[PDB]
């Protein structure tokens, strides 16, 4: 369900986008705006802008569109008279859930639960997903320390005024290069770009190095083992050190592939050993699959590649999943209500969409497709790397979750700008990487279409 | 548009709710669930549950349903073919807004901008609204201090690893009794109930007393003035104290009426003077209208009662507004992009609904209606207070934003439970208060429906 290919009329942003950008800039800083879109005319992998340009979208709204624009199955959903209520009657889900709440969850999120995690709480975005995952971990850790006993009077009084022992000085360990969100808890575990962090108060929490692999992988096996081993050791040293500082690490958060920090990969071995280190020190292992989740790596959750029956304690998600939330082990279930809570806790209308999305992913075998189409894309990227080593390096990926580096930021930006005017939307990450986040209806021939367009771009560059 | 009265079939929760609650409790702690709802049959002021009970809803999903259930105008929006894309193609608004983004904002949020605030950023909930308001304020304050100097190399370095000077030790001043959300920045400014705070790490930020008025107001004129004056003094002393601690107060956050902490009111004079204190010390004045905003006090924003051309620097909202976000003064506009940002920044489908909600609020004169229906409700509560002083005290309100105290938490809960079985849904707040948050289609006759039901309950209690 889509178009024959891209179709360009103007440079991007064109005159109509620039006019709208001017208008928007009156009421807010609109410098980040790429262009304005005609979503009504957008279909599948193709995004249409207000100047009528039709572009192959390989960025998919920062990796948040699961099965393409204007998907017919979703159109049908909105058209059904029985579904009107779900769009106009938003519940305070924590206290007054709709009749079909549990059954819709069975049809969607529960049908793709990670191994070992029977519990699920929903949230509206990745940031509150992670924030509440932190809180779940903090109260679990305190539960271990206090055992089956009541809150003390001192705890109940001091927590109201932001003081210990009611408010503990627990920490969450994160990695350099990580991105976990922008609210002030999330942000403390984020180490992506200075502009995300500067001028905002933070937490003194431990920050570990994330492995920086050397490419091609075939030539640096030993170097890369040594790099991962070094990082694992520093993780353990940090845990020990912060326990001594009386800032006990209650949890470790990591992405299976670091996105905003520059598509940084690491071996499955690294993550298995990281999981073990976490368990060994009594740390909750929190896997952030807000961006890797939803199938683009070839399996529904990227951590599935690790092949563990006990992959993690908590796993957050959002973006492609339409709603946010987190799965977790039964032992992390809050002991009392109103500790993990907010007004909306997601939105049943997003669950409605998600059930149909998961139905499409399964019926059309889109996990296999992502593996296959991703192989085609990565193969082509390796070929272009060979042919253009002065522009392309560190080609890397899993499924369609691929990326490469350019010599510098200006070349990176120029390549994105040229590709866009040629009908292909690409994302950047880090200071000089280009990344791919195609929707799940991205096929072989889209990979070939991109590769052939980019090939001629490089030839003329 | 509405039913004509409650109709009860069973106890609440009834057998079908209890069954669904048992199912949900398998996958998560479901102890907060009141009952399960049939939103398809709910209409106007009435919530229908899965056991067929029809209740007059005076709690409105924690004050978040603006013009009642299944409003025919919202029904017709979802039925329009041209609106289908808005519900199934959700954009990364910060980079790729839809063509109609600015116009739909003109039809909705911009048409009710607070005085003096030309800027608007949208967010998906109250918590990230407040979080990003804090961040806007921190960046503004730092910008004041560094003048036209650029980011120092040291700041750019240290901010990446959660260290000063890149991460300043700025504080937000908040009030005892406040509720501003659940994410870790918000939570530090929240001082509502211990169960919201316990076992979660916090910030050492200043906490001021919020005035506790004495009732009847007419008999405590001098006392209430002195109480408010005392609280103002303690605020100013805190700002000074924390400047010395090198934890400079960059902003002050306050609710025009404290909700979760027990519907605590203060005079318009108090807030005007608090605003003056904020400006005097160069603190941003942040008004949280997430719960007071959207008309139930008789004015669209509760701070409008204060009568100021310059009521605040930043004002956050959510709930009735369908979307969250914050308005702010031009001088608080972020200097660079990607500092206030996240994946979705709200949802255009909420803006679509909100434009129609605001149209209805204006055409049906619902601000004035809330002032009237609220006066009728308050008058009846005062009658019940006079007749039942063993149970009812401190009756108070503005518009339909009303409340009263009971003798203890046990009685508070019993009255709510009995009212519900008698066909009226009430909310609690604080330790022993009962509150009202009726939808904006709550009329004087609904006030009398409630009052007659509750009169009978009190006579038999
Ligand atoms: C791994 C990971 N964890 C958490 C988040 C936060 O999700 P949202 O709060 O934006 O929904 C994200 C969101 N992605 C994202 C990429 S850049 C953008 C930003 O805020 O600048 C946000 C994520 O990729
Ligand atoms: C004045 C005020 N400020 C901020 C918020 C946070 O909004 P949400 O994050 O819940 O959307 C709220 C939300 N209201 C609310 C009432 S109790 C509930 C909770 O989390 O327990 C949340 C609010 O009333
Ligand atoms: S923090 Fe997730 S929607 Fe506001």
How would you characterize this protein structure?
Two copies of one chain form a homodimer. Chain A is of the alpha/beta class and 461 residues long. Chain A has two domains: 1-70 and 366-461, Aspartate Aminotransferase, domain 1, CATH 3.90.1150.10; 71-365, Type I PLP-dependent aspartate aminotransferase-like (Major domain) (Aspartate Aminotransferase, domain 2). In chain A, 39% of the residues lie in helices and 13% in strands. Chain A contains 15 helices and 14 strands. In chain A, a hairpin with a 3-residue loop joins strand 13 and strand 14. In chain A, helix 5 (101-107) runs parallel beside helix 12 (348-363), helix 10 (221-244) packs parallel to helix 11 and helix 13 (366-387) packs parallel to helix 15. The longest helix of chain A is centred in the middle third of the chain and has 24 residues, at 221-244. Chain A is globular, with a radius of gyration of 23 Å. The interface between A and B is large, with 125 and 124 residues. The PDB classes it as transferase. The entry lists the keywords Synthesis, Biological Evaluation, Mechanistic Studies of Con-formationally-Restricted GABA-Aminotransferase Inactivators, transferase. The assembly is dimeric. The entry is titled "GABA-aminotransferase inactivated by conformationally-restricted inactivator".
